[PDB]
Amino acid sequence: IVGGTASVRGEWPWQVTLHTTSPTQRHLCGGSIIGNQWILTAAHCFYGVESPKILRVYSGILNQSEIKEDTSFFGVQEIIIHDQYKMAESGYDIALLKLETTVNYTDSQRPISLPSKGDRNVIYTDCWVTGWGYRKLRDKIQNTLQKAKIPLVTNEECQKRYRGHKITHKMICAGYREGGKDACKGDSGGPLSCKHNEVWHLVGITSWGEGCAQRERPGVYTNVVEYVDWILEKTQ
Ligand SMILES: [O-][n+]1cc(-c2c(-n3cnnn3)ccc(Cl)c2F)ccc1[C@@H](CC1CC1)n1cc(-c2cncs2)cn1
C-alpha cells in the first residue's frame, strides 16, 4: 500500500495473507474470508502455482513476522479460478480458495459480507484498501498490514485514464486524481472494503494498475457485485 498507515490487531479481521511454499515460503497475495471454508482472492495470484499443495492460508495476522514454523495455517483443498480468466488486465481476475477445514470465527478472523442484493445502486463513499504490499514501486513486502482510504472513480473516468485497455462493468476503479494512495506489488488479491450503514462489504478485489499511486492512474479492482452469482454457484 502506497501512502497508507499501519493497522492494529483485529482491525481488518477478514484479511488473510496467502503464502506459497515453493521454492521458499513467502507472502504471495492477499485474500478475504467470505465463509468458514472460503477465501476470495485474485486469479492472477496463481500464475506459476503448480497445485494447491504448496499454499498456506494464514488468518488473524497483523505482522508477517508473527508467522513461524509452529504458526497454525489452513491448507487449501481447491483453487477455483474463473473459467474466462486469461490475464488481470482483461478481467475475470477472481478466484475462490476452498479450505481443508472450517474457520472458527474469532475477534481476529471474521467474514466480510458480499455486496447485498438490492444494493446495486449504492454509492460507496467509505472504501479502504489493505495489504502487506510495497510502499512504492521498488520496495519490499511490509511487516505490518497497511491501510489506505481511497475514493471510487466512475468507469467513464477510469476508461479515459486507460485508453489502451477495455474497462468493463466487471471492473471498478479507485484513486485520487493527484495520486499518492494506491495498492502496489503484493497487495493483489486483497479486499477493497467499503462500509455502508455500518456494515462492511467486499466491493472489490485488488487486481492491477499502471505503476503505483501515479497521478491520474487509478487502481483497478474486480467488481465483486458482478460475480455474486458465480460465487454463490461455486460455494453452494
Ligand atoms: O500485488 N500486485 C499489485 C498490483 C497492482 C498495482 N501495481 C502495478 N505495478 N505494481 N503494482 C497497482 C494497482 C493495483 Cl490495484 C494493483 F493490484 C499488480 C500486481 C500485483 C502482484 C501480481 C502477482 C501476484 C501475481 N504482484 C506481487 C508482486 C510481489 C510479491 N512479492 C514481492 S513483489 C509483484 N506483483
Side-chain angles (χ1 to χ4, degrees):
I1 305 289
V2 185
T5 69
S7 305
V8 304
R9 206 165 291 280
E11 180 169 11
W12 306 101
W14 51 92
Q15 170 90 55
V16 303
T17 170
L18 172 65
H19 282 211
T20 178
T21 62
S22 189
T24 201
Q25 185 168 345
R26 71 177 176 88
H27 165 89
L28 178 65
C29 271
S32 301
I33 301 173
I34 64 164
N36 293 91
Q37 65 203 333
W38 294 105
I39 307 296
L40 194 66
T41 184
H44 186 200
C45 294
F46 305 97
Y47 182 75
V49 169
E50 48 263 55
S51 89
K53 302 176 176 189
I54 69 173
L55 297 179
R56 296 182 173 187
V57 175
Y58 292 95
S59 63
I61 297 301
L62 179 68
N63 295 323
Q64 292 286 328
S65 54
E66 300 165 35
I67 295 167
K68 296 281 102 182
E69 299 91 287
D70 73 331
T71 301
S72 61
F73 58 91
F74 300 89
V76 175
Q77 183 186 324
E78 186 178 11
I79 307 164
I80 306 181
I81 286 166
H82 197 289
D83 270 352
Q84 293 188 63
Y85 174 73
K86 292 186 163 191
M87 70 186 268
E89 289 81 357
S90 280
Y92 307 103
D93 192 11
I94 186 165
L96 284 159
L97 301 183
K98 192 175 185 200
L99 306 175
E100 290 279 15
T101 187
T102 47
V103 181
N104 267 45
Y105 296 143
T106 69
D107 253 327
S108 65
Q109 49 203 37
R110 305 268 319 139
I112 186 170
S113 165
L114 302 178
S116 296
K117 215 184 298 266
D119 271 356
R120 164 102 93 200
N121 293 330
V122 167
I123 308 301
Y124 294 101
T125 62
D126 190 16
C127 298
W128 293 75
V129 64
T130 47
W132 292 270
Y134 287 13
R135 293 152 311 162
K136 67 177 184 108
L137 197 58
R138 175 121 171 228
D139 199 23
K140 69 198 302 292
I141 296 302
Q142 294 307 295
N143 196 39
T144 306
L145 181 67
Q146 303 278 307
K147 60 179 186 171
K149 186 177 179 178
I150 296 191
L152 302 186
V153 171
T154 72
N155 279 46
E156 164 178 321
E157 180 167 352
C158 192
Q159 180 67 86
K160 284 161 162 47
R161 306 310 183 192
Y162 289 118
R163 296 211 172 290
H165 302 282
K166 301 194 283 197
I167 303 304
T168 75
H169 77 285
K170 291 191 137 50
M171 302 167 178
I172 189 153
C173 305
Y176 299 86
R177 45 182 103 79
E178 60 285 9
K181 287 188 169 175
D182 194 20
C184 200
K185 294 182 161 190
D187 294 319
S188 65
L192 178 66
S193 315
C194 308
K195 197 176 70 169
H196 175 54
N197 292 326
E198 314 304 321
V199 171
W200 289 93
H201 296 278
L202 183 52
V203 170
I205 304 167
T206 305
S207 184
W208 64 276
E210 182 186 300
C212 295
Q214 296 311 111
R215 145 181 300 280
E216 288 179 348
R217 295 283 182 280
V220 186
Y221 299 78
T222 300
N223 190 8
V224 175
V225 68
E226 292 291 336
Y227 295 91
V228 166
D229 284 341
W230 180 87
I231 293 166
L232 293 180
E233 177 199 324
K234 299 299 184 181
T235 64
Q236 36 94 7

